[PDB]
Symmetry: C3
Subunit: 151 residues, 3 copies
């Protein structure tokens, strides 16, 4: 009877938290984030070379943007369009030239290369940028691109 009165209070608390949390997620994602499935992309809103970008994401407890499907790529592309700045992806062929891999070593399960890419231009393009059109180009890791992490 008193337990029932307290379960009712606890029900009220949980329902309030569900509503407040849903409101808060919207606020957080505006304007630098995108939710797609169970993944969230967030941009830092500035540019860094690959190594520095990579470390920013890992230290934040995530990793560089790693679009694994067309839906993930479109969500990422919204951030790129919004900032009007091409972004680094996480993937490189630093280990084996011509074989792009995730930071875990896993081979790519999805790609969205621009026509003729990857072309290892100048024999030194081992990182990947995503353009405002969502297409990918291999690019030198030392260039500065928009930092976008995934969580």
């Amino acid at each position: 009877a008193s337990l029932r009165q307290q379960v009712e209070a606890l029900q009220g608390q949980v329902q309030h938290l569900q509503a407040a949390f849903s409101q808060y997620k919207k606020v957080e994602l505006f304007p630098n984030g995108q939710s797609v499935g169970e993944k969230i992309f967030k941009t830092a809103g500035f540019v860094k070379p690959f190594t520095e970008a990579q470390l920013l994401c890992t230290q934040a407890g995530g990793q560089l943007a790693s679009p694994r499907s067309a839906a993930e790529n479109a969500a990422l592309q919204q951030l790129v369009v919004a900032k009007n700045e091409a972004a680094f992806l996480s993937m490189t062929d630093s280990k084996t030239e011509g074989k792009f891999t995730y930071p875990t070593g896993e081979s790519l399960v999805y790609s969205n290369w621009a026509p003729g890419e990857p072309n290892d231009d100048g024999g030194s393009e081992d990182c990947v940028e995503i353009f405002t059109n969502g297409k990918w180009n291999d690019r030198a890791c030392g260039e500065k691109r928009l930092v976008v992490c995934e969580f």
Copy 2:
């Protein structure tokens, strides 16, 4: 009786979640948001024309800032003062000249017009900006103003 202790435990968990959420919400709003009642304003920190600004808020699951009381207006004014950039409100008289409405079509329930406003200057001011002094002015929708959404 063991159900009572299950309730005790779950309530401690919910109360810890309430505390963590409250902390993260304060962090979230600093420095680009303001809460007032159950409403949260958040600025994107850049300027856009009205149509673009409206779309950003709608796509984010909110709407352009729509202060409905002196308290809401003062909260919004804080962000405007902080960015030192006048902001668009959601309201327009596009449908019937001289009759400002919310996106839903409902007539205003609160206004804070600067003296002499609204005046439809040039015969073509159908949007509303809020100044750093918190007063409002009708302004051409094509002008660029600070994007502030409400959630």
Copy 3:
């Protein structure tokens, strides 16, 4: 009886909230926050003189960064390094020259003064900045430094 079904239901809702929120904490703190123990530092990303910075933090429901241990200081240092801008701490000897205190009036429980500091250079350094190397220097409160609040 049906109270057990309700507690079971709440358990599932709480687990979902906990998991969802855990992800959002990482997203929210990227790139402008740092968690350390139960404290969170968050930078505004811009510079202000002391009084203005202090007001920003207090109005946001927090206070200026107040590292109370080496671990807290190191965490604050990560933001300072990231932004590459020295920041104000909360502490001053404005009341009694040579005695630095927190806003509450309590004497320091931790300090990381650069050698020879505090030196009240020019007879007028009553505020404290933290450098990118994590060391502290007393500095004129009128100077503009990175705004970092704690929550």
